[PDB]
Amino acid sequence: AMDYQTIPSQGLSGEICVPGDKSISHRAVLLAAIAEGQTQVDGFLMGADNLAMVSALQQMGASIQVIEDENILVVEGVGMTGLQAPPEALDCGNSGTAIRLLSGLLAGQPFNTVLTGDSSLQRRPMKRIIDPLTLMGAKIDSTGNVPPLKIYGNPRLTGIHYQLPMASAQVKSCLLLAGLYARGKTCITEPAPSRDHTERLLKHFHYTLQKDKQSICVSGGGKLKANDISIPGDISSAAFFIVAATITPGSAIRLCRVGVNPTRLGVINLLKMMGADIEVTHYTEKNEEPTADITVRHARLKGIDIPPDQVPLTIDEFPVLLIAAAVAQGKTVLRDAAELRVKETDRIAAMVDGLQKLGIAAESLPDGVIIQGGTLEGGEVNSYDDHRIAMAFAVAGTLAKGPVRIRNCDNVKTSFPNFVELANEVGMNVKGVRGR
Numbered sequence: 001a002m003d004y005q006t007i008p009s010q011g012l013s014g015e016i017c018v019p020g021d022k023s024i025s026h027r028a029v030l031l032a033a034i035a036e037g038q039t040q041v042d043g044f045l046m047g048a049d050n051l052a053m054v055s056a057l058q059q060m061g062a063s064i065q066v067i068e069d070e071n072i073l074v075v076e077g078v079g080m081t082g083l084q085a086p087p088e089a090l091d092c093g094n095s096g097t098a099i100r101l102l103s104g105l106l107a108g109q110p111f112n113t114v115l116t117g118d119s120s121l122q123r124r125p126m127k128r129i130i131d132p133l134t135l136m137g138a139k140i141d142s143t144g145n146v147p148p149l150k151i152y153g154n155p156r157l158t159g160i161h162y163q164l165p166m167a168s169a170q171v172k173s174c175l176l177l178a179g180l181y182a183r184g185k186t187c188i189t190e191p192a193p194s195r196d197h198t199e200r201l202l203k204h205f206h207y208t209l210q211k212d213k214q215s216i217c218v219s220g221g222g223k224l225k226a227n228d229i230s231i232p233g234d235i236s237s238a239a240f241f242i243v244a245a246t247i248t249p250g251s252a253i254r255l256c257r258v259g260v261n262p263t264r265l266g267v268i269n270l271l272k273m274m275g276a277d278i279e280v281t282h283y284t285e286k287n288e289e290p291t292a293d294i295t296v297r298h299a300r301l302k303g304i305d306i307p308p309d310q311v312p313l314t315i316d317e318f319p320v321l322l323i324a325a326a327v328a329q330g331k332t333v334l335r336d337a338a339e340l341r342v343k344e345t346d347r348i349a350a351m352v353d354g355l356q357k358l359g360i361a362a363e364s365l366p367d368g369v370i371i372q373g374g375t376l377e378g379g380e381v382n383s384y385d386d387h388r389i390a391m392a393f394a395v396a397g398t399l400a401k402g403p404v405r406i407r408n409c410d411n412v413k414t415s416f417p418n419f420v421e422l423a424n425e426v427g428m429n430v431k432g433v434r435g436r
């Protein structure tokens with residue numbers, strides 16, 4: 001077992017490239033696997049989650065070459081129908097995105113699959129996918145609507161028209177994947193926009209798609225065409241440094257080549273409301289995906305009523321955003337964020353606990369949190385095995401009055417394998433030490 005241990009920072013400095021986008025990586029290798037022809041993937045995120053997806057695809061006869069130190073996959077497509085029946089259960093480790101997306105992929109296969117993962121994965125909710133898949137003709141067994149899932153593939157799904165009841169991109173993605181195998185039209189209606197990476201990669205792989213109103217549709221039985229993909233940096237990964245530089249005096253940093261999808265821009269929009277100093281420049285577009293350079297300077301913050309339309313666009317950044325709230329002047333309130341409770345861990349409970357442990361008055365609500373802006377002390381917090389709780393409290397350590405001990409950090413590598421190295425390079429202080 002490994003812990004992080006911080007000491008305060010005298011200012012972040014420098015220019016860094018965060019590594020690849022986790023969400024786009026999962027979609028990119030999945031689609032390339034069943035495409036026709038050879039897809040080269042740059043910027044692929046080499047973490048435990050994306051690698052678990054790579055493994056699962058290989059269990060089913062995908063032809064994937066992994067060049068770890070360059071962040072490159074070379075994928076030799078097997079076509080829509082080229083997958084083979086895996087002999088064992090697919091272990092998705094800690095990755096929610098992998099189990100929910102694979103389920104959509106696997107539902108229309110002419111074979112059977114067991115999908116499972118770690119302790120945390122085994123508590124994450126699956127009704128949200130089981131139900132609409134089932135309306136398309138899937139059979140999926142589970143106890144208590146959590147993994148493991150046993151999927152009795154049906155190569156004769158029929159498309160549905162379906163409204164998301166929570167703003168979930170995984171659910172939307174799961175269903176479009178199934179949609180490519182179903183007879184007729186599949187249409188997802190989404191009341192509140194969620195991350196649209198799947199949509200973009202379909203267009204990229206020259207599967208036609210159609211926006212309608214709030215709706216997006218595909219028809220089953222089209223063909224996916226190989227096309228090289230270059231993955232921009234994960235702005236979720238950049239979010240830790242964006243905060244860290246915001247709250248640490250004397251900080252000024254440039255973050256190169258980060259993805260700036262507006263459906264992912266939450267944390268920047270919200271920090272800006274709070275008074276932060278954040279410049280977005282040099283806009284590109286490689287492979288449908290907006291990419292830009294982000295400059296961050298130390299600024300003093302003010303508490304906000306987080307407007308609830310930003311919740312979907314910030315869902316992964318609330319752990320680190322709440323560190324910002326803790327050291328703002330005044331009160332911050334988060335509402336309509338109950339989704340935070342069903343993540344890798346319950347993120348509202350995890351953040352209330354560690355913030356209190358570090359001297360912050362923070363109060364839980366069933367769908368959010370009330371934070372009273374204050375002063376971070378040193379002490380000890382628990383990560384609850386959640387990568388982003390670990391990384392948020394490593395950020396907190398930059399301003400905290402004394403050292404911060406963050407217990408159990410091995411799952412940081414699920415989304416950010418070089419976090420410590422990049423944190424130290426720009427002037428945070430974070431070190432791996434033995435745990436218990």
Ligand SMILES: O=C(O)C1=C[C@@H](OP(=O)(O)O)[C@@H](O)[C@H](O)C1
Binds near residue numbers: 022023024097168195
């Ligand atoms: O589709 C994706 O890549 C993701 C969407 C979100 O999940 P929900 O669909 O549960 O909102 C997010 O929290 C997750 O980390 C990654």
Ligand SMILES: [K+]
Binds near residue numbers: 094095344
């Ligand atoms: K995860």
